[PDB]
Amino acid sequence: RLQPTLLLATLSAAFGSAFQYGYNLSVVNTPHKVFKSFYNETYFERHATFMDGKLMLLLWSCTVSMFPLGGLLGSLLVGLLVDSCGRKGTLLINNIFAIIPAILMGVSKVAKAFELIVFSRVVLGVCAGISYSALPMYLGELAPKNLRGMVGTMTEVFVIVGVFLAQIFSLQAILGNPAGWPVLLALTGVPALLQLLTLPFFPESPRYSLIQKGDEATARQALRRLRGHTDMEAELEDMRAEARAERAEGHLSVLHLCALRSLRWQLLSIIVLMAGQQLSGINAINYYADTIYTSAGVEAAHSQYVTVGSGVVNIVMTITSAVLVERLGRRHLLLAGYGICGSACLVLTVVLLFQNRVPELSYLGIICVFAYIAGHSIGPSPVPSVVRTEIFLQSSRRAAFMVDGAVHWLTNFIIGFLFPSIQEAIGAYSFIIFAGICLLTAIYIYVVIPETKGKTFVEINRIFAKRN
């Protein structure tokens, strides 16, 4: 982001959209006991008696796992909205599904009903899915080729920002109070309101207007504002060319995924990229981090502070990945991140197997956990978000993003509700599976995905064609 209008527009779009995804993704795991207690007190008030712990477990599983389900529905909904309202109107309508549930969760304690907390989780999941499938389109189409990587990475940058802010605000001292959780839950609507107030002042993505709506005039002004001075003649010609080529060849339409043979490899590439992000071990590092820090000598009274430090490392590594996308490229970052993740998983399996015999291995274990956090943050987290939009053309982007988001959310939910059993069924060799999965994903990325840095979309489509 060089021009100030583009930087402000990117900040306003990402802060109100990706922050919802991150915050509602990780705001509930830490203060679980408080919500347990509130549910049980509401049930006591309503029925004048306690209820079974099985109903506690079922209700908690529902309210903690409806967010992936809401995200999956939302991902398959961005379709009906993205090409109907542009990235702009889609992001603006996405704010309703983040403002209404925020108010519902805010007035929930006085209303004395947990349902509003269970239904608002589904609504916020829908909002998060729509945001995750719409914000990358807006950021990629807004930015020029020279600065496309940083603006595209801003999506995951602000996702991690929201995750870190939610981790900070979810501590017992800050807002995890039995009388402070309504504010914690309702804080997710403030960025939504700010984006609703700020974003309309910024221009719609020029590519959608010219290539899809046909209004070159509007595109010109938006570009003038976003691109500033300089020149736009060439940029406009690119859009016109990409429009002419797309019209001549055709576009993806969901119902004909296999019919369009040209983008089959690209669809496979994006599907493989998103699954390798979710099924590549981050769940295990999370489940095993507490045990690793406990064995490291850290008392249980700081296993949190260590989680906050891990979040800080995640933030720093994501920002440095945003900086280095336009310098080292995308393929290099993907390969480096997946290799670091695989090596960390391997050495973590080694230390977990040999933790009891040699207590001195705990330092290597915590180093490996932090190394995995950093490596997954740099390569596999934001670069797929940047690449999912670079490969595909304009009109095919809706179908491509529908498939990509559906796969991402489905893999997220599936792996989330399996590792528990796997952890038990297998032991620590779970990490070898993941470090296998990471190795396979890195091999596929090296073999198939080419370099798309500093290249317009017509070129990148040409490159993929030659691949096969």
Ligand SMILES: CC(=O)N[C@@H]1[C@@H](O)[C@H](O)[C@@H](CO)O[C@H]1O
């Ligand atoms: C439902 C459940 O998990 N058990 C709770 C438990 O917190 C405690 O025995 C008591 C506190 O008031 O209320 C029970 O219903």
